[PDB]
Amino acid sequence: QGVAFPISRDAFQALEKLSKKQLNYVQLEIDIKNETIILANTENTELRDLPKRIPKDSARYHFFLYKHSHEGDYLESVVFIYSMPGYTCSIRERMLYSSCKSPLLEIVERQLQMDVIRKIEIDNGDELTADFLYDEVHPK
């Protein structure tokens, strides 16, 4: 169950900006040996560029601002993404990303009042098509 790794000041500041909608994408990684969550990428990301942000060889955490219409409303929905490409990740890498997930999500809610509307887990970036994001957030 839940293991809490410290978050870098940088990673925390980028998540603080994403909660204030100043950034639309924050990718985080676990520094496995130092047991820390660090900042990996904060590029401006629209839904069409999102598939091309997901590494192919290593697991990652992503916070993405999903802007879309749903029954007449326009929603800016912060979504959480746990990408795990497969056996390229060691058992230790796979275990740390799974165990560190909940505490990171609790700290982000408790401190930054980020409203994570959905938590998604994917094998690879090519899955993050517009329809897929819509079916995860609004499964009907």
């Binding site: 169950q1 293991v3 497969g86 058992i91 796979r94 275990m95 799974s98 165990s99 997930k101 909940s102």
Partner: protein
Amino acid sequence: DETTALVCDNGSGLVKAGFAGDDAPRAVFPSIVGRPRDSYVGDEAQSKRGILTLKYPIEHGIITNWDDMEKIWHHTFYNELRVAPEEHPTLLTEAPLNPKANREKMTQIMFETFNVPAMYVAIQAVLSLYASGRTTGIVLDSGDGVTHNVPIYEGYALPHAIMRLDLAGRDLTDYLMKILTERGYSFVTTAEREIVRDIKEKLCYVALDFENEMATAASSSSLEKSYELPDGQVITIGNERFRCPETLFQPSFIGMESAGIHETTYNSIMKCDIDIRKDLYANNVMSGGTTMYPGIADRMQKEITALAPSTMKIKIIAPPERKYSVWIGGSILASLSTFQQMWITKQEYDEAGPSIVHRKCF
């Protein structure tokens, strides 16, 4: 380090115990206690069976006999690991559907009988799920005495949906023993059953299509494999190779009311909220020794796909380390410096009592 964290995966057939930080358990022995007709555990209890009443303290993953379970843990600490448990934090595993009172009992035995400085309890299925690289999915854990279908959502198992099949490696070994015994080759004693268990783990496989494979075996010897027995004799097995693990999909082969592991998976998923069914279908994670059969992931893949809705991506994840994925998962957890503040300490137990395990571990 004289205080290295310990990991004990208490299975109904085998105890996998070791040190946090290692890649594999240092100790693997049978969960058997023999008391005279003061006590014996493991291999020696089985050996002295002529003067003992043998017992399995872990019935279908659940610890049902605590006086006996204490004997297993005592043997684990002093005879297997050769450590004093009062100086090592101990991570323990628990079965799916393990009663909350049972979890409390385990905590009290660790702190009052063994005097451990700290302890942790994790569900076997969740550790295998986490080590696979995800937090939501359905786990098929098939071990020695029990097989479970466990839907897990964000690290929490869904008890209402968990399915239990009381059929696992123990039964498949018995079935292969009977199907070999009746075609000539006669195995009877506990040691001859161990030869059968070895034949089963080395030569058995799951057929993608059972009736097609029965036909291939009837018309040719393409599916035959040989095995040299300890005395030097060579035996050759044909359809027994796949008829034996086929019992997982057709439990009626050994007179069971329970449908196959593909149907109990479908049933388990159908008991959960329609909104999460897609996440379960795309993450069927296998774990346990009885999931080591070649061809089993391919077979589960086609069987789930034949029952599931046609708009579900069906994915079977079968890690190569799945025979020990529970122990390895716990080993990684307990080896972390940041895990130090997750343990239930003796002091926290003395103040709150055993119901601390529901909050601090879950």
